[PDB]
């Protein structure tokens, strides 16, 4: 939905912006690489349009520059250039660009390229989500966890076994990214993952359910025990001295909602997630850094 | 590597062909849709270039026509048209095209579009393969296996062929998870998968049917022979020295039910699953680590 337009020429940049902004998308402008880098760290950009003819140096500078500024680590870059020669397309790909427009760009070429970049990102994402384990944390991904939730709920319901579920979410994680950078944000996510993996019984099933959201099943554990064990981890996390890029100490916290225990009057695993999500929201709404059950 | 070029104009078709054929790819030519359909059924085509201005009918006829002629059921179609209006790009996508060139095509935009179409084909293929597979084991998932059971059963009834089915289930796997952790549980699931994939004839069809349940079809195999082959693997699994997180040795086993062989008095593939499940229960009830047939 969000498109970054990098182009020195004010009239050409505003014309590209109008075309993006007209055809349903949100346009974001940069006149130099300087202001561009601010915008990739600042907002979550879905696609990049890049003038391959900028102030200083060609774009074996630029393309590689844009890619490692990216908080997520990869991003579709569409090249905008007057280089018509087939040779120049290859160098752009080998440099790590996604696509290519010969200027003067037509409304049609521009829409086509953006649609293609977004289709590939979406397919790339659907594929990464079929993986069992999240690469950065080693925890279960969402789709696998959803199959394990359905299975453990069916099993616990048939066997009149206890099953407690927690949904936790880092408190104001965007401010950690904005203030200290995405690399420090990664360290904070992996530190929470480490605490989650080292604190619960082997029997607990731990998922990275979203960017900074974690779902934990506690088979044979009632809501009161699950709450106290999760609250001890919440407490240990609030006391972690994290170090910034420049060695400043900062703290983070998470909020958590716990649902289930006795499943006798919970008809489905979706109802269990609904209750954990409601308790999460109540935790988020009542001062954060707490557990609601 | 192989690109189909559909274009009436002989001069334009040969020019597109030269550009494809020059830049490392193989060019395959069609002057009408008739010749085109012969080429998609005949050879394995990686990408389609399509003239949206052909002899007969518009191109919401053409695009949907090319798609379902495909033996694989999908193909990346790049549109080649004089329709420069933004509106016309959307119609092409909603019709099911992959990409779009405004004629007269430049060598550069043609190569760019083909590169894009090949990245999408590659992701589309990897995804179709995850959709029939259990990602953790590389075996068929349950959804595929139910359809493949129905097909092999109907095939074996047409040919009066033998078809034996085994349903296996890991013995006290919950205690393995609770004692050793879900990571170790997953390694146990993959280790069983490895044994199942390395032990049977090529023609055997192996599925992960559920969390810790696997269904194996043995086409042209009687119950007694399937039982021997399965019991040898049951025995090999019982001997595997699995290692915990802290290098503690443990063993697992599975129980098995074998059904079928002669299908003459089994009216449907469900009756086959029922009998394998009954014999599984008898295996589980009589001390586990055994096969009942
Ligand atoms: N560093 C980093 N940041 C990530 C990652 N995945 C997602 N994020 C970022 O985390 C943020 C998501 O947090 P939000 O859901 O906005 O809420 P929040 O900022 O934590 O606020 P709240 O207190 O309501 O939870 C923005 C998103 O880009 C990741 O892998 N690494
Ligand atoms: N690691 C892991 N374990 C799984 C997975 N799916 C299921 N499980 C485990 O399977 C367990 C099934 O337990 P039960 O149905 O009581 O059967 P069992 O414990 O295997 O005992 P039985 O011998 O009667 O089959 C629950 C869960 O711990 C999975 O994908 N990974
Ligand atoms: Mg410029
Ligand atoms: Mg969140
Ligand atoms: Mg948050
Ligand atoms: Mg023509
Ligand atoms: Mg079972
Ligand atoms: Mg079992």
Author numbering:
A (entry chain B), B (entry chain A): 6 to 298
From the paper:
C-di-GMP is a near-ubiquitous bacterial second messenger responsible for the coordination of a variety of cellular processes and behaviour, including motility, biofilm formation, virulence and cell cycle progression. DGCs catalyse the condensation of two molecules of GTP to yield the twofold symmetric c-di-GMP product. DgcR from Leptospira biflexa is a constitutively dimeric prototype of this class of diguanylate cyclases. Here, we show by biophysical and crystallographic analyses that DgcR is a constitutive dimer that changes coiled-coil geometry and domain arrangement upon pseudo-phosphorylation.
A DgcR variant (R206A/D209A, abbreviated DgcR_AxxA) that had the putative allosteric inhibition site mutated was used to avoid locking the enzyme in a product-inhibited conformation. Crystallisation was performed in presence of 3’-deoxy-GTP (3’dGTP), which is a non-competent substrate analogue due to the absence of the 3’-hydroxyl group. The structure of native DgcR_AxxA (called DgcR’) was solved by molecular replacement to 2.2 Å resolution. There is one dimer in the asymmetric unit with the protomers held together by extensive isologous contacts between the Rec domains involving their α4-β5-α5 face. Notably, the electron density of the Rec domains is considerably weaker than that of the GGDEF domains, indicating a larger mobility. The GGDEF domains do not obey the twofold symmetry of the Rec domains, but form a relative angle of about 90°. Thus, the two active sites with the bound GTP analogues do not face each other rendering this constellation clearly non-productive. Though the constellation may be determined to some extent by crystal packing, it demonstrates considerable inter-domain flexibility. Comparison of the main-chain torsion angles reveals that the relative rotation can be traced back to a 169° change in a single torsion, namely around the Cα–C bond of residue 136 (ψ136). The native Rec dimer with a buried surface area of 980 Å2 is held together by an extended apolar contact of α5 (A117, F120) with α4 (F94, I98), an ionic interaction of D104 with R118, an H-bond between main-chain carbonyl 102 and R124 (both β5-α5 contacts).
